[PDB]
Amino acid sequence: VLYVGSKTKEGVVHDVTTVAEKTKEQVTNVGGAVVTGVTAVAQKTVEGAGSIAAATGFVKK
Amino acid sequence: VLYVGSKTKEGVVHDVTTVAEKTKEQVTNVGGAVVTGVTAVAQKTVEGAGSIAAATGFVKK
Amino acid sequence: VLYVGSKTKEGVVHDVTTVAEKTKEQVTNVGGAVVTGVTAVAQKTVEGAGSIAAATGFVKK
Amino acid sequence: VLYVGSKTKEGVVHDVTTVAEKTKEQVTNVGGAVVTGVTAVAQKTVEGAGSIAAATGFVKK
Amino acid sequence: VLYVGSKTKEGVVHDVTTVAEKTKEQVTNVGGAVVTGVTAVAQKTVEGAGSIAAATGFVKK
Amino acid sequence: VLYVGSKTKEGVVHDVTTVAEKTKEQVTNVGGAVVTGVTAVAQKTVEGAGSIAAATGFVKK
């Protein structure tokens, strides 16, 4: 592995834009909720996951 | 593996734009919910997943 | 592993912009909730996850 | 002219709403211009006009 | 002219609302310009006008 | 002219609201300009005008 002249981007997340306005969100009767917005993950070498969003619920009433 | 002159992008996520306005969201009676927005993941070498969004629920009433 | 002349970005998260205005959020009757905004994670070598957002709930009424 | 019990509205202008957003206006090469927005005029007894918007121009080039 | 019990509104201008956001205006090469916004005029008895917006121009180039 | 019990509003201008945000205005090459905002005028008895916005210009170049 060698690089004489290079520009190597390996596992990069850039130039991510996000605009949100006058939005609205309501979660009313939820067992388990997960509400996220922007979620940027970068990694060169992995063994597990990169982004996990898990939810387990129960609503009896 | 060698690079004399190069521009190598390996596992890159760039120039991601997102605009949202006057939106509306409602989750009312949910066991388990997962609401996400932008989710940018980049990785060169992986062994597991890249993005997991799991939900397991139950609604009795 | 060697680099004579290079610009190597390995596991980088940059230039992440986010604008939010006049938004609204309501979580009313939730067992377990997780509300996030921007979540930037970068890492070269991993063994576990990169970002975990888990929620487990229960709503009896 | 008499009023025992009354609610007389004589020459009234009420409940005027106006919303403008992300608009755009350009007047570039104009002799005489008149740009107005909301213009509410009320009057019981008149002898002249109620609202005058006059413009007289000339463009030679 | 007499009023025993009354609520007489004679030449009234009320409850005028106006919202403007992220607007834009440009007048570039104008002889005479008149740019107005909200203009509320009320008067019971008149002999002339109520609101005059006049403009007289000339553009030679 | 007489009033036993009354609430007479004669030439009134009330409850005028105005909201402006992130607006922009540019007048660049103008002979005579008149830029106004809110202009509330009330008067019971008049002989002339109520609001005059006049502009007379000239642009040679």
Swiss-Prot record, chains A, B, C, D, E, F:
Sequence repeat segments: 6-20, 21-31
UniProt PTM comment: Phosphorylated, predominantly on serine residues. Phosphorylation by CK1 appears to occur on residues distinct from the residue phosphorylated by other kinases.
Annotated segments matching region 4 X 11 AA tandem repeats of [EGS]-K-T-K-[EQ]-[GQ]-V-X(4): 1-31
Chain positions with Phosphoserine modification: 51
Amino-acid positions noted as binding Cu cation in the UniProt annotation, renumbered to this chain: 14
Organ and tissue specificity: Highly expressed in presynaptic terminals in the central nervous system. Expressed principally in brain.
Subcellular localization(s) per the UniProt record: Cytoplasm; Membrane; Nucleus; Synapse
Task performed by this protein: Neuronal protein that plays several roles in synaptic activity such as regulation of synaptic vesicle trafficking and subsequent neurotransmitter release. Participates as a monomer in synaptic vesicle exocytosis by enhancing vesicle priming, fusion and dilation of exocytotic fusion pores. Mechanistically, acts by increasing local Ca(2+) release from microdomains which is essential for the enhancement of ATP-induced exocytosis.
Quaternary structure and partners: Soluble monomer. Homotetramer. A dynamic intracellular population of tetramers and monomers coexists normally and the tetramer plays an essential role in maintaining homeostasis. Interacts with UCHL1. Interacts with phospholipase D and histones. Interacts (via N-terminus) with synphilin-1/SNCAIP; this interaction promotes formation of SNCA inclusions in the cytoplasm. Interacts with CALM1. Interacts with STXBP1; this interaction controls SNCA self-replicating aggregation. Interacts with SNARE components VAMP2 and SNAP25; these interactions allows SNARE complex assembly and integrity.
Family: Belongs to the synuclein family.
Domain notes: The 'non A-beta component of Alzheimer disease amyloid plaque' domain (NAC domain) is involved in fibrils formation. The middle hydrophobic region forms the core of the filaments. The C-terminus may regulate aggregation and determine the diameter of the filaments.
Disease tied to this entry: Genetic alterations of SNCA resulting in aberrant polymerization into fibrils, are associated with several neurodegenerative diseases (synucleinopathies). SNCA fibrillar aggregates represent the major non A-beta component of Alzheimer disease amyloid plaque, and a major component of Lewy body inclusions. They are also found within Lewy body (LB)-like intraneuronal inclusions, glial inclusions and axonal spheroids in neurodegeneration with brain iron accumulation type 1. Parkinson disease 1, autosomal dominant: A complex neurodegenerative disorder characterized by bradykinesia, resting tremor, muscular rigidity and postural instability. Additional features are characteristic postural abnormalities, dysautonomia, dystonic cramps, and dementia. The pathology of Parkinson disease involves the loss of dopaminergic neurons in the substantia nigra and the presence of Lewy bodies (intraneuronal accumulations of aggregated proteins), in surviving neurons in various areas of the brain.
Name the record gives this protein: Alpha-synuclein
Annotated source species: Homo sapiens (Human)
Gene: SNCA
Residues of the full protein shown: 37 to 97 of 140
